Symmetry: C4
Subunit: 387 residues, 4 copies
Amino acid sequence: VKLAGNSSLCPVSGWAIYSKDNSVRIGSKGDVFVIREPFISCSPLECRTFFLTQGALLNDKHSNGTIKDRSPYRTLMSCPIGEVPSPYNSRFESVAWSASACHDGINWLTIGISGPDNGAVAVLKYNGIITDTIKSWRNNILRTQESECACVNGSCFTVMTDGPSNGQASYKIFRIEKGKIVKSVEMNAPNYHYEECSCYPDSSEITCVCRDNWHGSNRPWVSFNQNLEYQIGYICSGIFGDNPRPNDKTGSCGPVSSNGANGVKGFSFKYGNGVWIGRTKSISSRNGFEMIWDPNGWTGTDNNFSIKQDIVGINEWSGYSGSFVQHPELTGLDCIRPCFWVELIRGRPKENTIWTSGSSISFCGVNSDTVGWSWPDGAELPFTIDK
Amino acid sequence: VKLAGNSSLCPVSGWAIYSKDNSVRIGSKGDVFVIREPFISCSPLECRTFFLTQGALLNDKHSNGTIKDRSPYRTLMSCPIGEVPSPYNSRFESVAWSASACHDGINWLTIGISGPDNGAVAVLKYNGIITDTIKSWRNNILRTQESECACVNGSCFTVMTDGPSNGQASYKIFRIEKGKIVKSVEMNAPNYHYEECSCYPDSSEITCVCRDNWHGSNRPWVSFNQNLEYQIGYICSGIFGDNPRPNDKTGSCGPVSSNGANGVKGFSFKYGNGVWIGRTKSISSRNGFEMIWDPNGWTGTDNNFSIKQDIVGINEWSGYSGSFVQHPELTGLDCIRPCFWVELIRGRPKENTIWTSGSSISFCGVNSDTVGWSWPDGAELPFTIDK
Amino acid sequence: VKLAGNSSLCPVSGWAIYSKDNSVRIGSKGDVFVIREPFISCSPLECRTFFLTQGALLNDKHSNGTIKDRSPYRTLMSCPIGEVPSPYNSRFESVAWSASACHDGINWLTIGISGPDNGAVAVLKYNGIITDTIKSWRNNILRTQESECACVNGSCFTVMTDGPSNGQASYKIFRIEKGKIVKSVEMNAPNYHYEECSCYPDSSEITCVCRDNWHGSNRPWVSFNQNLEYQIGYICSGIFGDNPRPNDKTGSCGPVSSNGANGVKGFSFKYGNGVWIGRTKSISSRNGFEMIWDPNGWTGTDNNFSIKQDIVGINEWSGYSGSFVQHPELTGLDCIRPCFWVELIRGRPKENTIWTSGSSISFCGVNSDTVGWSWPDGAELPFTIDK
Amino acid sequence: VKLAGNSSLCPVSGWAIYSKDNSVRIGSKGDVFVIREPFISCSPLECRTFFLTQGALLNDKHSNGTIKDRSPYRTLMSCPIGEVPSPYNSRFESVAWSASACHDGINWLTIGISGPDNGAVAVLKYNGIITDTIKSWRNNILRTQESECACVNGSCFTVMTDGPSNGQASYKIFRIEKGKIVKSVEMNAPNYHYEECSCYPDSSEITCVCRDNWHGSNRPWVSFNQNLEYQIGYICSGIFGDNPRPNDKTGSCGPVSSNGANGVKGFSFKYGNGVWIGRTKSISSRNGFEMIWDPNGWTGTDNNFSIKQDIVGINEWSGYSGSFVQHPELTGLDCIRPCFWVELIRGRPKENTIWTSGSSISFCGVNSDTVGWSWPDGAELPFTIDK
Ligand SMILES: CC(=O)N[C@H]1[C@H]([C@H](O)[C@H](O)CO)OC(C(=O)O)=C[C@@H]1NC(=N)N
Ligand SMILES: CC(=O)N[C@H]1[C@H]([C@H](O)[C@H](O)CO)OC(C(=O)O)=C[C@@H]1NC(=N)N
Ligand SMILES: CC(=O)N[C@H]1[C@H]([C@H](O)[C@H](O)CO)OC(C(=O)O)=C[C@@H]1NC(=N)N
Ligand SMILES: CC(=O)N[C@H]1[C@H]([C@H](O)[C@H](O)CO)OC(C(=O)O)=C[C@@H]1NC(=N)N
Ligand SMILES: *[C@@H]1O[C@H](CO)[C@@H](O)[C@H](O)[C@H]1NC(C)=O
Ligand SMILES: *[C@@H]1O[C@H](CO)[C@@H](O)[C@H](O)[C@H]1NC(C)=O
Ligand SMILES: *[C@@H]1O[C@H](CO)[C@@H](O)[C@H](O)[C@H]1NC(C)=O
Ligand SMILES: *[C@@H]1O[C@H](CO)[C@@H](O)[C@H](O)[C@H]1NC(C)=O
Ligand SMILES: *[C@@H]1O[C@H](CO)[C@@H](O)[C@H](O)[C@H]1NC(C)=O
Ligand SMILES: *[C@@H]1O[C@H](CO)[C@@H](O)[C@H](O)[C@H]1NC(C)=O
Ligand SMILES: *[C@@H]1O[C@H](CO)[C@@H](O)[C@H](O)[C@H]1NC(C)=O
Ligand SMILES: *[C@@H]1O[C@H](CO)[C@@H](O)[C@H](O)[C@H]1NC(C)=O
Ligand SMILES: [Ca+2]
Ligand SMILES: [Ca+2]
Ligand SMILES: [Ca+2]
Ligand SMILES: [Ca+2]
Ligand SMILES: [Ca+2]
């Protein structure tokens, strides 16, 4: 039965651990896909991990040069949450080097993007049957969330970007029903840069927090209702949420240009003026991960904050992070539950290997007791294939 | 419920990618089967890849000599589409060095041929229970589709061949109900040659686009109704569909004698006088893949066409291709949906290995935007076991 | 719903091939159990392979010594017919160095004998739950069918043997209901020897063909009814069933003493005074396999016969062989369908390895065309673990 | 339906072997989790083995140092009884270096503890959804059963411990409904020590037999009803159940201090004044396992017993052990069947390897015959990774 999507977000005081797959540790001996850009999505029955394979296994030669982002071998697959991504336990979803997925309560919708950099095509599938396509309109790397899309009342919403990664690009919001694109809209957003949006449903409204690769080290947000009427802004908190970023100082309601180029995929959950900010501990590279509660972070520009929970220690490897939710239909609760995941990138460029891959951890928001710790990857690199 | 088969083949403008298994790249380290002759068939609930294994895993010594077509070791097996053929995720079907399979909407029918070239016998299983057999009637390598068979309203149809591959052979058309051969017609087709027929339902009638190993570098076709009343012909288009073949020029409505000896198994979708042709990019070897829409190719003999979509690059290994459909029962559509797959042959006789295996890719037709690319095998040869 | 057991054996002219797993070949790389004593039994829904693992993998140090018949590491496991027996696809049944299994149409019954040679205990499970045991009554290797028990009207029947192999031992029949033993009878068989019976239902009565390891080169048989009233004898046919055996001569209704010591597990199907005989092709060793129809060979001492179908050629390894049946409730037929499996033993003591394991092929009785051939194991010995 | 747990515990005279996984043997070559602390729990439909992985595989470098008790890499996982703990056959439960699990008849409840030693948080999942948490209240290694919690009429019960391992600590009992902690009680147990309780239901009440790591060589117990009203004491039998322990002699209803320090997880079944004691055969180290019937052991301090049964030999490594039950809803009996499992520890600290892992065996109480034997782990150490 379809997901109502009309409840508010559970107010949550801390983050309890939900999963860890240990993929790279196990992959040293096991048959584990080289993957990256992993994410989690839940259905009214199960929660799955979705990932982009590199069409190759760990500690094998075809993991050579897998730092590369796009190829015709990359595919989106999924497995149950907490299990290593394996040829022997993973469902095939689509051929993709950029992807999103979610479940309307009835069926899985997956969006996979493959093809040339200047002509990429997005394949929408509803219950594994192709239902639509969307072709690149700016002819410069069509790309999407690498996180769950968001479903409200039988409709599913996503953001896509085409254009430069180092200047003004174009951003469309899609509304999908049964894998059919039924409405789209181009955000008129001069000086904003949106990428890899982390989008969640909250009171029949979608909110997305994204990646400014052009010139923002804080995150841009876009929010919109079912009719794709949208609002936009930047998270005003001087506790910056991108990577790279400056040391915390007074923030902006626009893109903080200082250390704003490049970035990483991230998320934040909005509660009124308050915001839960997921972020790396290191300001210069993908190490560490922490969760911060700033009661005025969404719209205030100061950097004072209340709560910090540690998730990955400063000296340990992190990467992408995304939001995922559990709906009352699955949870039984009166509200939609905030969760987040963290990719733990290993290999190139930071380590001396011929390959890049990641594992994952995940957390769900609660009001009961919670603890900070460090849950890093744990693999001893380099592996045998590097010698 | 059983598949109606009564609707018309969906009009398609371009092909969107559906699956890529990366079977060979992953076979480097993983436990994957040496396979060839893969193909895809759907039930109303799921789509599956079928394949003949060589009863052997990749990068093991038992892949030695796997260029050989027939042995008592080959078994027909299947796994969910897009996944790698591994003995951990594969379902056993039959013992076979030539096969066919299809689902009538109720249960899977499979046909596996094994035994000596002198008098091989086909075994028919319905829900995995032997339900009929048929023995060679010319004592010269009884062989069938290596493709999905077609089903319309409870009856399933396939095409078998017995006899020379380099001259006149015998051709039988079968009607199969619940696993039992209930009718067969011997085809009166002197100077026609049919092997490895790709067959699909289209308005309660079946169309087969097959291979002429004898003396045609265009493709033989046979249409028939439920009572196995048939019409035979050849694809008239000057965009010759076989491999090997001559350069494109004036077509013929009989077999195109030039470079007609030998062949690859292939497919085509008929649309009035038009034809959607899928073929190799090279005219001399199993390399490259492309779809061509010839608006008059079924009946006309020019080599003119209106659309070309690139599937596999010219310089990269391809091989077999075959048709498959997705019925309204599976899709919700009011038409039978045309799809296809391409086997990607690796190793012998073209490459310096001790083995021959294949990976697969597949596409389904749409009217929405699409793009041509190259989605090749990707593995680096030779492997550890060749060295 | 219960297996009826009330219908007759299907008359069958020949044997169509049904499964081939390629276990030892695949085991050269893939993670495959070293097993032996495999056998097939079918529920009214699926057919499974039961095997006795040695609790080790192929090509690993622990396969060392696997010629050993008994140990505390041997477990009875289960996998889908034709698939390779591995930790990744097999189901745990019982701890066992001698076993039996059969489905009554409601649930699986399993019988797993383990423990010391001088006081073994058979554990009976019904639907995975233990439901009875029985202690050795002769304190010399309590041992049983190594092949499917036969079921009629909700009761399941088996034969077990306890005592010496070099002479006269003791033999009991059992009627098991819901995994409870409800009746047991000791066969009064002075000068008969019974081991590893292949038992099949047929017109509500059980017929077992067994193994004389003591002094009989033709095969002993017990027939009984639902009340365990029984008749015994030997297969009269001059076509000697057991191996080792003499060359074919005139036979006897009692134990043929010429080459009567030792033996191999085997099977045969009775049809009136006729008999279908499955046996090795060699008279000295476990090589070859062939099926033979002697229309009077059940009661007639003549060495004539009218059908010989090749299964495994004389120069190839074979070994154990048993009967398995398929009931109407699974096939929709109007009778009980005979089928058999052959185990293909590789390694010690005939081949220079540190291990003994085996693969399996199976056939089912049909009335349409069949051919004979050779379907051997086909692995190249010795393995890496032997070098 | 939800388990009643109102029947009494089925009285038994011996223990028949139920399952053996052969983990470390299979792990030599195959992809098997480095684990420890395994336990069995059962739903009304199936039986599963839970285990605490070390986020690594046997015979891989990542198993290095796996003698450490707690780490971020440790996760609670489960698989079907008797299958090896594999990335390919095993399910993710939660992240845990301490755990319990049980099934109320409707859904699996899991508890996983992770975090710092001074801050560990127990996360509770019901059907894989986080439903509660409980944090360390004494800041000293929060820990739980390492076996199945017991279930009664929709409520599940567990015991937890926080505090010193070598002195007075804090013990608490919990009532869990659908994953919600509904009631908890702190035991007033001065001069007692509780850890790793084995808890079973018996006539709508809960009996836990535990471990005194402080100063007790016999095991403590705590019985309680659904309302969390409890009585406490120590197993009075002079046949001591802990390890290390001193020589069997006269017992005590309080802490027997000789060798009292330290211990090993165990179990025992109460039968009026009678006790079924499971214990290692060595008094100094985890070697061997035996079952012993002391008809007055619960309340009488003499060291006489009626039955002893050999499980694992003295010259073989044992390890942990615990109870598990098979409710009438699963077996069909009218009592709650007692069953136990034994962890067979291999590697450090007792052997020359870099790793530690455990295999397992299980037994079920019967009334029919059994046999004493020795089903030891059977692996040949060291492995290649230790060389
Ligand atoms: C489509 C694509 O390649 N997206 C990139 C992403 C991208 O380059 C930046 O956002 C710039 O626009 O960089 C990130 C990254 O790790 O920084 C990897 C992504 N990899 C893939 N999704 N495969
Ligand atoms: C039964 C059989 O061996 N069919 C052959 C096929 C055939 O020989 C030609 O069509 C000539 O008749 O050639 C093709 C081929 O790749 O050319 C491989 C097929 N291999 C398998 N189907 N196994
Ligand atoms: C219980 C037992 O050990 N059965 C033996 C069997 C036996 O030796 C003969 O029947 C003689 O008594 O021979 C066969 C055999 O290979 O000849 C192996 C069996 N091995 C196993 N089933 N484990
Ligand atoms: C939570 C924890 O660390 N538990 C320890 C346990 C513990 O040290 C003792 O009970 C005393 O406090 O000892 C046992 C043990 O081997 O004796 C291993 C346990 N390993 C795991 N549970 N992970
Ligand atoms: C939300 O959706 C439910 C289910 O359709 C509906 O009954 C209810 O009216 C809505 N309640 C709110 C405002 O959350
Ligand atoms: C990876 O690639 C480079 C060239 O692209 C090559 O030099 C190197 O040997 C490769 N590594 C492996 C192990 O294949
Ligand atoms: C949900 O879906 C239907 C689709 O027609 C729509 O009409 C209705 O307004 C929606 N109800 C809500 C917002 O709960
Ligand atoms: C064939 O197609 C028509 C139109 O879709 C449908 O109404 C009819 O039920 C089908 N016929 C049969 C016999 O199933
Ligand atoms: C395969 O067999 C060939 C002979 O055809 C032999 O030359 C080669 O060494 C073999 N390769 C392997 C690794 O088995
Ligand atoms: C097998 O057994 C023998 C005798 O114990 C031993 O010496 C040999 O090395 C073993 N082979 C293995 C374990 O590879
Ligand atoms: C256990 O509970 C069930 C349901 O209330 C009941 O039918 C049964 O008799 C009970 N047994 C007792 C009370 O011992
Ligand atoms: C395990 O631990 C020690 C210390 O890290 C190291 O010296 C040793 O080489 C390791 N062993 C392996 C094979 O990883
Ligand atoms: Ca940035
Ligand atoms: Ca040709
Ligand atoms: Ca004999
Ligand atoms: Ca005769
Ligand atoms: Ca103690």
